[PDB]
Design an enzyme around this catalytic site. Sequence first.
Site, mmCIF file in Angstrom:
data_model
loop_
_atom_site.group_PDB
_atom_site.id
_atom_site.type_symbol
_atom_site.label_atom_id
_atom_site.label_comp_id
_atom_site.label_asym_id
_atom_site.label_seq_id
_atom_site.Cartn_x
_atom_site.Cartn_y
_atom_site.Cartn_z
ATOM 1 C CE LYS A 1 -3.742 -2.512 0.076
ATOM 2 N NZ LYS A 1 -4.532 -2.525 -1.446
ATOM 3 C CG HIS B 1 -6.819 -0.768 -4.352
ATOM 4 N ND1 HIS B 1 -8.344 -0.524 -3.404
ATOM 5 C CD2 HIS B 1 -6.491 -1.764 -3.832
ATOM 6 C CE1 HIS B 1 -8.113 -1.687 -2.526
ATOM 7 N NE2 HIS B 1 -7.184 -2.396 -2.863
ATOM 8 C CB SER C 1 -13.568 -2.386 2.385
ATOM 9 O OG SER C 1 -13.312 -3.287 3.512
HETATM 10 MN MN LIG Z 1 -6.277 -3.698 -1.311
#
Ligand SMILES: [Mn+2]
Length: 603
Positions: A235, A255, A277
């Site tokens: 990240k 992403h 998410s």
């Molecule tokens: Mn991720």
Amino acid sequence: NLSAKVVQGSLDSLPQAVREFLENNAELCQPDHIHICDGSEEENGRLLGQMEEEGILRRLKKYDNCWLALTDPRDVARIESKTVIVTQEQRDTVPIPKTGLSQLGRWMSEEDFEKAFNARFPGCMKGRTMYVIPFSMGPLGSPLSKIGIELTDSPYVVASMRIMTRMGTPVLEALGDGEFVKCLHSVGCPLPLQKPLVNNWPCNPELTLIAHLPDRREIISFGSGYGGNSLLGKKCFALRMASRLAKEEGWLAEHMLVLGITNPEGEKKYLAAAFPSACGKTNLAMMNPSLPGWKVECVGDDIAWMKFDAQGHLRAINPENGFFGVAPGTSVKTNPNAIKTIQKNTIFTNVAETSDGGVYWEGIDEPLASGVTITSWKNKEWSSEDGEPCAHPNSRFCTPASQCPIIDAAWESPEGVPIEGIIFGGRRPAGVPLVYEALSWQHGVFVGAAMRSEAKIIMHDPFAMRPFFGYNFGKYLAHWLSMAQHPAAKLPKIFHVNWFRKDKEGKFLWPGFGENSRVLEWMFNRIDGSTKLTPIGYIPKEDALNLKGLGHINMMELFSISKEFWDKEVEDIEKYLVDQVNADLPCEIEREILALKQRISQM
Ligand SMILES: [Mn+2]
Ligand code: NA
């Protein structure tokens, strides 16, 4: 002097810049020893044993070479409130919002970061070993890969990085006298320990801070041992720092998972998807498709670096080496390819452990044998009856990409794979159809900009990059918009999907998993050149979606677009974008907001 503390490798074989970086931080951190990692099996095996002796990992004897880490419950996730990017001017990092605090990033001044730093690092590695991890993000030795050096006092970090990146002596040889990203990490518990240790897992939640200094090409992280916070190539480097580099040098760091799908006539396309998410990312990336004759293969499940080639095709590479997947909810039914992947050489973190040495978690959907019992992630005997999950909801598996039985043959081709479609998404219980396509590139950018997902709270996660922008999101939106003035660009088609629409009783309208291949089929054929126009974009015309072999599907409700839901949606999107992006919001986006309002007003 320093050489006297080296327990592996030699100062004299490190490129000089790597040696200076090591020297400067060893003097600062005061570790008892220096271990130059070589990436070898034997080193890995050695570090595993050491970790087992110290209680950091347990063997999972049901499988070939798997291990389980349990953490301090205060340290169970990437923590955005402690994550900052440091720049001379605030605006380079986040837009100044109209009201409230920005939710697009968290800037810290260089003056503030210098005090924060000095309060944390001096002497932090006392009593421990400082490991030196040479790692590459991207196939080893490619021209298009980037290299980093991560210093850490956590062997869990080392072993995880060996999986999630290419690590060791071959990276140092490839790097030679080149430049690298400097990555400094400490769990923040110098010995003698000043506070108790829960599960042999050192962390300092109070001082936890994950900093990025793009002008210095440094990532500096303190006090969490956990994944997103400690595994700095993923990240911190491959998304944040890189998205900023990419904006400067013509490419994209995003992403997105990347998969290659082949139809029953042998034609193959690569697709990229950015989901927020808990939207099934790994599940799509390594999907076992239900449709006969179709094939899905996995390039990456998390991040992608993309750049137009010479004929204008957007090529992607997966800069990672492995999968750091959320475990709960993983089972043979939901993701048979993930299960097979993690059968060996895997580290698990905060999952439950069976009495025969296996792993367990909510949704694994695998009956226990007579007499097998479960130890939860807090090290306590566990039962359904206790009212807490046996595995932490953010628990993970960390597994070699090469082990995925459908890993794409091109997953490490240094020339990347050509993206023909980009897919955005989120968890939307109401209002948003199963799939729709964008009207134009600018509209596609707006669709990504508008992304929201129910985490009982619905939040904005634009392009699924909200926690990861390396720089001003308004500038990122300009950078994407500008792709359409790239000479001869072959722009990917843009779609938006929602696997989570529910009826009034909260039951899913769409079965998902392998059946998602029906939606990919329609995108595939759209890329090949059919549709029904709606105010939000195109949906499949009646009967276009392949439903053969499925039980009944309420198509009408699944694809329903109500004026009232959408009046509120666009009002929400406008408010969000004008407020959070403010003086940086590109006029192309403004026009797309208005245009959607105009289309919705016509219903
Ligand atoms: Mn991720
Ligand atoms: Na997380």
